[PDB]
Design brief:
The structure is cut from a larger assembly and holds 8 protein chains of 7 kinds. Chain A is of the alpha+beta class and about 140 residues long. Chain A is built from 2 helices and 7 strands, in the order αββββαβββ. A two-stranded antiparallel sheet of chain E has the order 1-2. Classes of the chains: A alpha+beta (about 140), B mainly beta (about 80), C mainly alpha (about 40), D mainly alpha (about 30), E mainly alpha (about 70), G mainly alpha (about 150), H mainly alpha (about 725). Bound molecules: digalactosyl diacyl glycerol (dgdg), chlorophyll A (6 copies), 1,2-distearoyl-monogalactosyl-diglyceride, beta-carotene (2 copies), phylloquinone (PQN) and iron/sulfur cluster (2 copies). Chain C: It comes from Pisum sativum (Garden pea).
């Protein structure tokens, strides 16, 4: 069921002159994110944190401090440059966690191997009033 | 972590999925409409609460609802 | 001419002409009967 | 001996200092 | 158009020559109000046998510095 | 703040009337140096003191200025 | 009289205020030439003030201790000219305006694009409609009685 | 858990400073706390009520102690009209020598504060004379607060904590409160007035050590049980009676005169004792209405359900209302706050026109301070009542159990209510502002005689109907053969007519066009504030823009920028916007009251009459004119006793202004600024050795609105209090 690609260190990182928008202590003690793509040719792109960087020929790896930054970079790589990308979440313990595209196909296209999470089989107007769920730990929408 | 719910009025237009800026929503197989699709929210732990998904839903009322809940460092969108 | 009439009836232009006419009418009424605080005719 | 002279500093400097220290310790640490 | 309006108002509805004869004495003015709803009180005594609204735009000084002496030039 | 500073300084230390002996009587008697160093002085010796001219303007040719004062507040 | 006020015609502070106003106006007049344009304007204003005060005394307005006219709106028939017949006139005019506008809105509500006739006023239709406000007091009354003034089903 | 707050597990896991803020701002919202039940909620409320009672008793005890310790009471009672009462001493090491010189007043040995709460007059009237009495009262109240805390703790403990079924016993609680809390309390107050205050106002000093040896009346209790009660009113105090002396004193203990005491210009003490006795009788009788354990009386719910009109104009009437009121605590709190605000405003309106404390009518600054006090508190209470009504709609309302009753029908035609209230507000605002601007333009052109001065003829007619004879309307009480006038000629009308027609007090002031215009401004304010609050409440459960609002809670930032944008869509935000209008309306009320009274106290009511009709008159003749001594409280040539107010006047101007910050600038800007600040701190030598433990974040949207409103209100109140006290006290007249 789509073995997620394994993060490969030693892959070159994009040409960048340094910035004040990079990683901070959260990356050191909590978590940080890594995005990888291929880019057929060397070209200049807009970084999600600072100015402009140049993608090296072949594989490129970039580490960001936020998942939203990774998604913005992936969207720009997918729509402007027509490049396929994947990014991971890295913990200080040394763990890596494949994140996106979770099942090899982007979440936009329906896949037969996905289960429903948080789907309510009713219209939004058929939720109970708060009084019916008062003094119970549940919320009217959680039902 | 904010709570995102998908209601059965969803028409599987996919516009909410295109809008999420943290990859929280998905499209899953379904049988109650013409598209055989419906939205899912399996990764609400990464939801930032932007409610950009709701702005894209064409049904009335909405088929995707975001209920802001307990805040985490991921939900607060903090890079430090 | 036809398009001139059409544009000449658009909301802003029509409103300004209407209010200019109303202002002139009220100004003249006040000029003829100024300082009027009551209706004395009946 | 002037009772106000003893208490005004006591309630305006000592009391807020001790209270703020204690409440900062209570609010700001894992239990 | 705005500048032409300025110069015309200075030419017709102003006491420019009276001010020119005695600058420090007369207060410059280049706007009068018609008497309609008791607003003629705004036509104050600005000197030079004139009643109007005193102007602070400083046009009279510019015209004096340019050499304009009569209303024909304005 | 810049225009307030300019106005008060000019009135206090520059503008005024000269006399025969050369004694300059300034519109405001040089109170800027000693009154402008506190906020209470700005509220009292500038705003309160100098608002008397505008608020009293009713019944005269400057009544329009008082009307605009109140309307601008509104 | 009503509310302890006295008629302006026989009131004293009213006359004092009249005299003071004329004195203030005349003070400016003596500065200019006797027969200059400013002098003529000031004389016209003085005559206007005299006429105003005489008319206020004539109509029988009530003056308080301040010496200014006061309007009685309780409904006393001696003062219907102060608020009630002007009130009826206003109600007539305002109902004219509202009825004409409502008639226009109802008339243009049947087109495929009614908004087009709302940002660009269809003057031909409006000129025909404006005159219904002469008789709107009857049209609205029969509109209510006939039961179609108010949108049923709502 | 595992950290502050312990009542919210969701907040305790917030890694930002938000946890602290929201930790403090939800401590008393028990319903939203984790693992909350019914009995737990009710017991917590009960204990908190005990804590509040203890705090109130401690506060009033502190007032007593300070007035007894650094006060002026013993000197004040010697000459109440020519000595300023002292609140408490000042010990500030920041004071300079001239400040110490300026602040030593009232015959004290050091800097002191002049009390304006009016406690001196109140304590003097009730009978307190020496500092020993004040000390005993303070000690008794300290004991009382300790007992209140003991009761709270006792009922916290198991085996003493009441069950929920006990809390919801409405019939017995109403019976006891009406017949006990209200009736017996007023009966006891009448007893004190008869036994201590009335003798105190006649020379005798009745105290604990001799009150059993002194007869309150020469024929004690003989007339009462025999039924010949008139003997208790046979010899009232003569009109030539000095207060605390026996010169011209009577023996009557109960009377009904209706006027004022000629010397103190306040209500007769005997009249007040009679009032309290009467209403005590009424409450005692009326508190036997509902059924308890004795098999007689009423059941409230049956009365409610039986009140349904035939014809179905009210639907099912009041059926089901007992259960929605008894089970919904927010409904109870809203009703209580509404009634409390109404009667607080009533207290404010009655205290200035019918003073009850001796020599307080001559203390002008005290009167003004008390009136403004009670009016602002009443406004806050009313706004809170509406807020809690909206909260009830959100939380405790059950649509099905309230099917077709008055509440549901209110909810289902909310739009007509809101639209008509909007029309009323629009009419009032349009025409009031139009008339004000017309008059102002008229005076701008130098033609005051062309103003639209409308005589408040209806109010003048009502005043004439009360007996005033300055408008010549000749109505009930102001006529001569009317049954209403003739019926009371021998009881209270003599004194009442003497007081009302007397034109140096505030009993029904003469009114004119300025009063008409300002009253219509008041009506505009009331209607618009009610519009905002009613709209916020009735639309709390949801509207067309957000039909599922009930599921989002009472307070939330918004619903995002979709559907056109949903800023300030909560009911909390409706209350938020209504607070501004409440402040504005109460400000108009107090401006009107203070200007009228400051011009009357100067014998210059004309000046107000001329200058009230137009707004420039309000701006110049009131704000600018009465603000010279205050702003001169300190200047480059020294300072005087008013400097403290001049400082506060500026302080209130600053707070208010910084309130504009949180109200105009919004979160995103501040969040990005704080992000760059965090980067900078983390990137600097020697300071990165120090590490924050809660991640800094910008204030929440709702929190920012609340903080901005709090700043706005604090600045409003402080600046107006400074102005009012300095201007009235500056002239002392
Ligand atoms: C002193 C004692 C005696 C007093 C006698 C008083 C009589 C009334 C006063 C004056 C009468 C002479 C008026 C001029 C003559 C022409 C009026 C006319 O027939 O002009 C023709 C119109 C037509 O009237 C009706 O007009 C209505 C609306 O039609 C049209 O209305 C518009 C007309 O321009 C547009 O064409 C629009 O598209 C269309 O809706 C109806 O539907 C019918 O078309 C038609 O019956 O009359 C109109 O109201 C034109 C607008 C003016 C009407 C004035 C009525 C009085 C007020
Ligand atoms: C809530 C009532 C109250 C209030 C508002 C004040 C206010 C004030 N008191 Mg005071 N006091 C009070 C009650 C009160 N007191 C009581 C009941 C006593 C015992 C009889 C005292 C005994 C006292 C003394 C001896 C002195 C003051 C002084 C002062 C002034 C300077 C500050 C100070 O010394 O702190 C207060 C000092 C104390 C010793 C107070 C202790 C007594 C109470 C029980 C403390 C309450 C703490 C409690 C946890 C919080 C209450 C609830 C809430 C208000 C927070 C100040 C204006 C000083 C002064 O004279 O000013 C120049 C001074 O020396 N007070
Ligand atoms: C000077 C400040 C000011 C003014 C004048 C108003 C005025 C008004 N507020 Mg408002 N408000 C204010 C401050 C102010 N507010 C502040 C600081 C807050 C806190 C955020 C609020 C919050 C608030 C709320 C929540 C609500 C209002 C509402 C209203 C309206 C109530 C209806 C009414 O009274 O009829 C009219 C009152 C008038 C004063 C008439 C104004 C128009 C006059 C006639 C001028 C006409 C234009 C003239 C021809 C010149 C045109 C010039 C040209 C260049 C165009 C009213 C227009 C309520 C509302 O909308 O009513 C339904 C409403 O719900 N206010
Ligand atoms: C609710 C607000 C309000 C109201 C009720 C009034 C009312 C009045 N104003 Mg006023 N005014 C206002 C606001 C208001 N104003 C404001 C905001 C301003 C500032 C712009 C002014 C500035 C102003 C001026 C300068 C003057 C007035 C004047 C007047 C009076 C003139 C009546 C008239 O024109 O003759 C009668 C008019 C008619 C009968 C016209 C209707 C007839 C129709 C066209 C025919 C119908 C046929 C059937 C009147 C009592 C005048 C005055 O003399 O005051 C005493 C005048 O000089 N107003
Ligand atoms: C809760 C209020 C209250 C309280 C606790 C008291 C208490 C007292 N009053 Mg008093 N009184 C009160 C209200 C109160 N009164 C009021 C409102 C009035 C005005 C009518 C009076 C007028 C009054 C007079 C004229 C006298 C007292 C007297 C007394 C004392 C003896 C009464 C007695 O035992 O006779 C008998 C009691 C009964 C037969 C019980 C009555 C039946 C009850 C209602 C059940 C006693 C300490 C007497 C005294 O000598 O003072 C020392 C005295 O003569 N009172
Ligand atoms: C008997 C009166 C009463 C009672 C028992 C309650 C009880 C309650 N109210 Mg309520 N309320 C009341 C009156 C009352 N209210 C009034 C009169 C108003 C009108 C202003 C309000 C308006 C109101 C609103 C809008 C809300 C409540 C809410 C609540 C609930 C949670 C409150 C909480 O824990 O927040 C924590 C307490 C605070 C945040 C208070 C700290 C901040 C204050 C305002 C600062 C004080 C001013 C400042 C320090 C003084 C100046 C300092 C210096 C310069 C002198 C709670 C059950 C909230 C709720 O959740 O409903 C379910 C809610 O949103 N109330
Ligand atoms: C009276 C109103 C008021 C005040 C006081 C301020 C104050 C401030 N604004 Mg501001 N602002 C206001 C209105 C106000 N604003 C309004 C209405 C808006 C809407 C447009 C804005 C929008 C705005 C923006 C967008 C920004 C600011 C910023 C700032 C800060 C600039 C930094 C600075 O000056 O350093 C020092 C602070 C001061 C000089 C203020 C007074 C400090 C006093 C003198 C110190 C007293 C200390 C005292 C000993 C404390 C002891 C008390 C103890 C009991 C706690 C400053 C705190 C900027 C900022 O944050 O800076 C990066 C910023 O970006 N404001
Ligand atoms: C003078 C100022 C007062 C004027 C009062 C005018 C008469 C009002 C009573 C009649 C109202 C009326 O008939 O319509 C009553 C209107 C509706 O109007 C009704 O409509 C019905 C359905 O079309 C029928 O046509 C009825 O004939 C018609 O009267 O409804 C109401 O206002 C409710 C009142 C009770 C009916
Ligand atoms: C929101 C809501 C709420 C609340 C609300 C409110 C609060 C309202 C109000 C209101 C009010 C607050 C009112 C008041 C009133 C009053 C009245 C209505 C009155 C009257 C009248 C009469 C009966 C009179 C009489 C008389 C006499 C006796 C003699 C002399 C004269 C006179 C006339 C005075 C709640 C929570 C509940 C619930 C939910 C909803
Ligand atoms: C006499 C008088 C008075 C008073 C009075 C009163 C108080 C009454 C009333 C009243 C009322 C109680 C009214 C009502 C109403 C109601 C309703 C219900 C209605 C309606 C209407 C409508 C709805 C209309 C519509 C329209 C029109 C017709 C116009 C235009 C168009 C339109 C469509 C808009 C006084 C003393 C002050 C003074 C003197 C005068
Ligand atoms: C200034 C500002 C901030 C930033 C405000 C911050 C970071 C608060 C910093 C204040 C510090 C902590 C000192 C405050 C001192 C207080 C007097 C202390 C009160 C604490 C207790 C006594 C209650 C926002 O986050 C914001 C958000 C949304 C709308 C408007 C605004 C806004 O105006
Ligand atoms: S609120 Fe924003 S982040 Fe959360 S699910 Fe919707 S679009 Fe995605
Ligand atoms: S935008 Fe709405 S309708 Fe479209 S797929 Fe998402 S939830 Fe369904």
């Amino acid at each position: 069921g789509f073995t997620p690609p394994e993060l490969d260190p030693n892959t070159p990182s994009p040409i960048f002159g340094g910035s004040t928008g990079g990683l901070l202590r959260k990356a050191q003690v909590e978590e940080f994110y890594v995005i990888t793509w291929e880019s057929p040719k060397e070209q200049i792109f807009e970084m999600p944190t600072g100015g402009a960087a140049i993608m090296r020929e072949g594989p490129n790896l970039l580490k960001l401090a936020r998942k939203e930054q990774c998604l913005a970079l992936g969207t720009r790589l997918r729509s402007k440059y027509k490049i396929k990308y994947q990014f991971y979440r890295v913990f200080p313990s040394g763990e890596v966690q494949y994140l996106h595209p979770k099942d090899g196909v982007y979440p936009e296209k329906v896949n037969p191997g996905r289960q429903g999470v948080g789907v309510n089989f009713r219209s939004i107007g058929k939720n109970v009033s708060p009084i019916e769920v008062k003094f119970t730990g549940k919320q009217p929408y959680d039902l | 972590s904010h709570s995102v719910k998908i209601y059965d009025t969803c028409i599987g237009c996919t516009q909410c999925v295109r809008a999420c800026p943290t990859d929280v929503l998905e499209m899953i197989p379904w049988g109650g409409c013409k598209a055989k699709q419906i939205a899912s929210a399996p990764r609400t732990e990464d939801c930032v609460g932007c409610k950009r998904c709701e702005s894209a839903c064409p049904t009335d009322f909405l088929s995707v609802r975001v209920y802001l809940w307990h805040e985490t460092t991921r939900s607060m969108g903090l890079a430090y | 001419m036809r398009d001139l009439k059409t544009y000449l009836s658009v909301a802003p232009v029509a409103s300004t002409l209407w209010f200019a006419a109303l202002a002139g009418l009220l100004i003249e009424i006040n000029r003829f009967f100024p300082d009027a605080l009551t209706f004395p005719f009946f | 001996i002037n009772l106000p002279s003893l208490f005004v500093p006591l309630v305006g400097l000592l009391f807020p200092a001790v209270a703020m220290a204690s409440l900062f310790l209570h609010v700001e640490k894992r239990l | 158009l705005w500048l032409s309006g300025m110069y015309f108002h200075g030419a017709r509805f102003s006491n420019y020559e009276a001010w020119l004869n005695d600058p420090t004495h007369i207060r410059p003015s280049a706007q009068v109000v018609w008497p309609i709803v008791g607003q003629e009180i705004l036509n104050g005594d600005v000197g030079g046998g004139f009643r109007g609204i005193q102007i602070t735009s400083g046009f009279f000084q510019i015209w004096r510095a340019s050499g304009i002496t009569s209303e024909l030039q304005l | 703040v810049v225009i307030f500073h300019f106005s008060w300084k000019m009135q206090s230390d520059v503008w005024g009337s000269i006399n025969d002996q050369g004694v300059v009587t300034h519109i405001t008697g040089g109170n800027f140096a000693q009154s402008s160093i506190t906020i209470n002085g700005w509220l009292r010796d500038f705003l309160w003191a100098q608002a008397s001219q505008v608020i009293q303007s009713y019944g005269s040719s400057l009544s329009a200025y008082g009307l605009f004062f109140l309307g601008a507040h509104f | 009289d009503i509310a302890g006020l006295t008629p302006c015609k026989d009131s004293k502070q009213f006359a004092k205020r009249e005299k003071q106003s004329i004195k203030k106006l005349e003070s400016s007049l003596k500065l200019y030439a006797p027969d200059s344009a400013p002098a003529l304007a000031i004389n016209a204003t003085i005559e206007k003030t005299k006429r105003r005060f005489d008319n206020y005394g004539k109509q029988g307005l009530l003056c308080g201790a301040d010496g200014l006219p006061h309007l009685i709106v309780s409904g006393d028939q001696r003062h219907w000219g102060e608020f009630i017949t002007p009130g009826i006139l206003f109600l007539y005019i305002a109902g004219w305006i509202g009825w004409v506008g409502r008639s226009y809105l109802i008339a243009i509500r049947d087109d495929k694009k009614p908004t087009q006739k709302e940002i660009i006023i269809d003057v031909p239709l409006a000129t025909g409609l404006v005159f219904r406000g002469f008789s709107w007091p009857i049209a609205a009354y029969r509109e209510l009685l006939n039961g179609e003034l108010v949108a049923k089903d709502v | 858990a595992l950290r502050f707050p312990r009542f919210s597990q969701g907040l305790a896991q917030d890694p930002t400073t938000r946890r602290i803020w929201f930790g403090i701002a939800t401590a008393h919202d028990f319903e939203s706390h984790d693992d909350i039940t019914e009995g737990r909620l009710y017991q917590n409320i009960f204990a908190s009520h005990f804590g509040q009672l203890a705090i109130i008793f401690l506060w009033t005890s502190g007032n007593l102690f300070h007035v007894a310790w650094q006060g002026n009471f013993e000197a004040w009672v010697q000459d109440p009209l020519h000595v300023r009462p002292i609140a408490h001493a000042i010990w500030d090491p920041h004071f300079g020598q001239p400040a110490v010189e300026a602040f030593t007043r009232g015959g004290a040995l050091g800097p002191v504060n002049i009390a304006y709460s009016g406690v001196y007059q109140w304590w003097y009237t009730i009978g307190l004379r020496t500092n020993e009495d004040l000390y005993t009262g303070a000690i008794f109240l300290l004991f009382l607060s300790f007992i209140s805390l003991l009761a709270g703790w006792l009922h916290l403990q198991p085996k003493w904590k009441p069950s929920v079924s006990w809390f919801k016993n409405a019939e017995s609680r109403l019976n006891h409160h009406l017949s006990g809390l209200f009736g017996v309390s007023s009966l006891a107050w009448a007893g004190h007035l008869v036994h201590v205050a009335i003798p105190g106002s006649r020379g005798e000093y009745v105290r604990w050590n001799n009150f059993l040896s002194v007869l309150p009346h020469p024929q004690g209790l003989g007339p009462l049980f025999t039924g010949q009660w008139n003997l208790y009113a046979q010899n009232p105090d003569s009109s030539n009676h000095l207060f605390s002396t026996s010169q011209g004193a009577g023996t009557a203990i109960l009377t009904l005169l209706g006027g004022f005491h000629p010397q103190t210009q306040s209500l007769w003490l005997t009249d007040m004792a009679h009032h309290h006795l009467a209403i005590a009788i009424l409450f005692l009788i009326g508190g036997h209405m509902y059924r308890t354990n004795f098999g007689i009386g009423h059941s409230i719910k049956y009365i409610l359900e039986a009140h349904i009109p035939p014809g179905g104009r009210l639907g099912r009437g009041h059926k089901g209302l007992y259960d929605t009121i008894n089970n919904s605590i927010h409904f109870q709190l809203g009703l209580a706050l509404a009634s409390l605000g109404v009667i607080t405003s009533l207290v404010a309106q009655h205290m200035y026109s019918l003073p009850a404390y001796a020599f307080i009518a001559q203390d002008f600054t005290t009167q003004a301070a008390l009136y403004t006090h009670h009016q602002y508190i009443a406004g806050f209470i009313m706004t809170g009542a509406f807020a809690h009504g909206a909260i009830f709609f959100i939380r405790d309302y059950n649509p099905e159990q309230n099917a077709d009753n008055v509440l549901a029908r209110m909810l289902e035609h909310k739009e007509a209510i809101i639209s008509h209230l909007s029309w009323a507000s629009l009419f009032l605002g349009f025409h009031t502002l139009g008339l004000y601007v017309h008059n102002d333009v008229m005076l701008a052109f130098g033609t005051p005689e062309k103003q639209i001065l409308i005589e408040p003829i209806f109010a003048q007619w009502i005043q004439s109907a009360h007996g005033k004879t300055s408008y010549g309307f000749d109505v009930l009480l102001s006529s001569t053969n009317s049954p209403a006038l003739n019926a009371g000629r021998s009881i209270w009308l003599p004194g009442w007519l003497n007081a009302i027609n007397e034109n140096s007090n505030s009993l029904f002031l003469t009114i004119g066009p300025g009063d008409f215009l300002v009253h219509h401004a008041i009506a505009l304010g009331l209607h618009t504030t009610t519009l905002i609050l009613v709209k916020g409440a009735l639309d709390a459960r949801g509207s067309k823009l957000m039909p599922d609002k009930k599921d989002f809670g009472y307070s939330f930032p918004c619903d995002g920028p979709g559907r056109g944008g949903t800023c300030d869509i909560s009911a909390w935000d409706a209350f938020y916007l209504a607070v501004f209008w409440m402040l504005n309306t109460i400000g108009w009320v107090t401006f009107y009251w203070h200007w009228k009274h400051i011009t009357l106290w100067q014998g210059n009511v004309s000046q107000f009459n001329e200058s009230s009709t137009y707004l420039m008159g309000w701006l110049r003749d009131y704000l600018w004119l009465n603000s010279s001594q205050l702003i001169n409280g300190y200047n480059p040539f020294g300072m005087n006793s008013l400097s403290v107010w001049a400082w506060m006047f500026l302080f209130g101007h600053l707070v208010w202004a910084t309130g504009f910050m949180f109200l105009i600038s919004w979160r995103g800007y501040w969040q990005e600024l704080i992000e760059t600040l965090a980067w900078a701190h983390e990137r600097t030598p020697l300071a990165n050795l120090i590490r924050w433990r809660d991640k800094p974040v910008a204030l929440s949207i709702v929190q920012a609105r609340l903080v901005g409103l709090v700043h706005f209100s604090v600045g409003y109140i402080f600046t107006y209090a400074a102005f009012l006290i300095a201007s009235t006290s500056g002239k002392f007249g």
